[PDB]
Amino acid sequence: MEKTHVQLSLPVLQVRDVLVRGFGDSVEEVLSEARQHLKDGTCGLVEVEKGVLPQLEQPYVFIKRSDARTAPHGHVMVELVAELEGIQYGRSGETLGVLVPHVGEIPVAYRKVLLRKN
Numbered sequence: 001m002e003k004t005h006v007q008l009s010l011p012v013l014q015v016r017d018v019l020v021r022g023f024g025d026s027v028e029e030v031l032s033e034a035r036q037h038l039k040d041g042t043c044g045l046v047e048v049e050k051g052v053l054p055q056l057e058q059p060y061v062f063i064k065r066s067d068a069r070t071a072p073h074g075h076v077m078v079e080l081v082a083e084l085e086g087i088q089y090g091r092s093g094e095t096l097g098v099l100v101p102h103v104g105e106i107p108v109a110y111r112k113v114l115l116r117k118n
């Protein structure tokens with residue numbers, strides 16, 4: 001009875017503050033853990049710039065834009081895509097950032113998203 005999408009406000013973290021630098025050790029695990037942390041309100045977002053990904057741990061979980069016409073209630077529609085060793089699991093639009101566990105780091109902003117569940 002999970003609605004297909006959920007409105008979330010994600011804390012945006014600076015990469016050097018992140019204490020837990022990924023969600024796990026395989027593509028399936030990181031997608032599973034990302035979904036669980038999103039559900040629990042314990043997921044942050046790191047915006048990708050030069051130097052960011054080498055400071056985080058693979059596999060990566062990205063949120064990517066899933067369409068261009070609808071940003072309901074100010075929230076960009078996104079979906080999850082994982083990456084390991086240059087191979088991506090899913091295809092989607094432009095990256096908004098990389099998801100990481102949030103364990104109390106102080107954010108620099110919040111990013112409003114409408115996230116596709118499954």
Ligand SMILES: Nc1nc2ccc(F)cc2s1
Binds near residue numbers: 002034035038116118
């Ligand atoms: N299967 C599920 N994925 C998500 C992703 C995000 C969320 F908030 C809840 C759920 S339940």
